[PDB]
Design a protein around this ligand. Structure first.
Ligand SMILES: *[B@@]1([O])OC2=C(C([O])=O)[C]=[C][C]=C2[C][C]1[N]C(=O)[C]([N]C(=O)N1[C][C]N([C][C])C(=O)C1=O)C1=[C][C]=C(P([O])([O])=O)[C]=[C]1
Length: 324
């Protein structure tokens, strides 16, 4: 028997289709995982191939929690540390944020989705340390999910990284993974620091997780990620009534012919709830919205909200706070 929950599958399908229609987008996908087992509760794509497993995207800002996790886990950074987040150069490349903040603490880097702050965290580590961490999250690794045509994604050897590439990989460019790989990587945060295998079969034995970060680090990162869905974060459209939700938005210019183009984007929204003791991960991507807005928050945040909210209801998880 499949691990798929048909009521979640139905909800995800309807919500995805509504958003793809409304935003006149090219394509999209939803993955729902069990946060403590890695079982696939739902996996839906717009018509055609199984893009969730076959296609690789650059994660963009959806990678930033991992860079933050690695920093905190090393003991070298505390969440209250403040960083200079002004634009700066690497060789003759510029790292800069959409909206300039002079300084941000780690909570701020998460909340506001700072490229500069993320790159400063990664710059405390060597290429080999960062590569090993991305590898350990499963980037460029086969999941062996049972799906045919499953991509391993792309993680170039650290032996060939330029300094700019370390920076850009820390905020999610130059490495690639499927939506299912990206949802899987979030089990590190939900399953107390251990990466889980993904499966579409009902589990019979407790899955063997592989330790990537300390449980204390995973807990802290989940707490920081609630900032994304509260006032001041990029991801308030994904807030769910009655729960605290940890999430990350991602808005990427689309890589098309080796070029990154400024008039095509890919919107990603990934999160988990309840944030303190999560039951589910929901990941959403919509490719090339064209109806006006293209930011993750407006395009994918409402599908995340409805699928997460509906999923928690279906699985019989009580709200942790009064509905409003
Ligand atoms: B990230 O996705 O977080 C966000 C979000 C969000 O949280 O939803 C919204 C807006 C900006 C950002 C910053 C993060 N994304 C970006 O920085 C985007 N960057 C890129 O697409 N690229 C392409 C490739 N390279 C070289 C490898 C880059 O350095 C790079 O940064 C981004 C997103 C939107 C824009 P636009 O079109 O609105 O100007 C530009 C860049």
């Amino acid at each position: 028997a499949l691990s798929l929950d048909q009521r979640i599958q139905t909800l995800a399908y309807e919500e995805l289709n509504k958003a793809v229609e409304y935003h006149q987008a090219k394509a999209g996908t939803v993955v729902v995982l069990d946060a403590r087992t890695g079982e696939i509760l739902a996996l839906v794509n717009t018509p055609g191939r199984n893009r969730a497993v076959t296609d690789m995207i650059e994660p963009g800002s959806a990678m930033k929690p991992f860079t933050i996790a690695k920093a905190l886990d090393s003991g070298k950074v505390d969440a209250t540390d403040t960083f200079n987040t002004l634009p700066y150069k690497i060789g003759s490349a510029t790292v800069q944020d959409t909206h300039v903040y002079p300084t941000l603490d780690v909570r701020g880097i998460m909340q506001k989705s700072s490229n500069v702050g993320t790159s400063k965290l990664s710059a405390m580590f060597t290429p080999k340390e960062m590569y090993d961490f991305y590898h350990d999250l499963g980037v460029g690794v086969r999941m062996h999910s049972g799906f045919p045509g499953e991509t391993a994604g792309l993680l170039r050897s650290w032996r060939r990284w330029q300094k700019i590439e370390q920076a850009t990989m820390s905020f999610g460019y130059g490495l690639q993974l499927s939506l299912l790989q990206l949802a899987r990587a979030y089990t590190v945060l939900t399953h107390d620091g251990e990466l889980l295998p993904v499966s579409f079969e009902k589990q019979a034995v407790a899955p063997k997780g592989k330790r990537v970060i300390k449980a204390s680090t995973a807990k802290k990162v989940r707490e920081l990620m609630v900032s994304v869905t509260e006032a001041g974060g990029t991801g308030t459209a994904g807030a769910v009534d009655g729960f605290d939700v940890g999430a990350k938005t991602g808005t990427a210019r689309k890589l098309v012919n080796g070029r990154y183009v400024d008039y095509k984007h890919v919107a990603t929204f990934i999160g988990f709830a309840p944030a303190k003791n999560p039951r589910v991960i929901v990941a959403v991507t919509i490719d090339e919205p064209t109806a006006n807005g293209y930011y993750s928050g407006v395009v994918t945040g409402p599908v995340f909200k409805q699928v997460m909210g509906g999923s928690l209801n279906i699985l019989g998880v009580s709200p942790t706070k009064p509905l409003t």
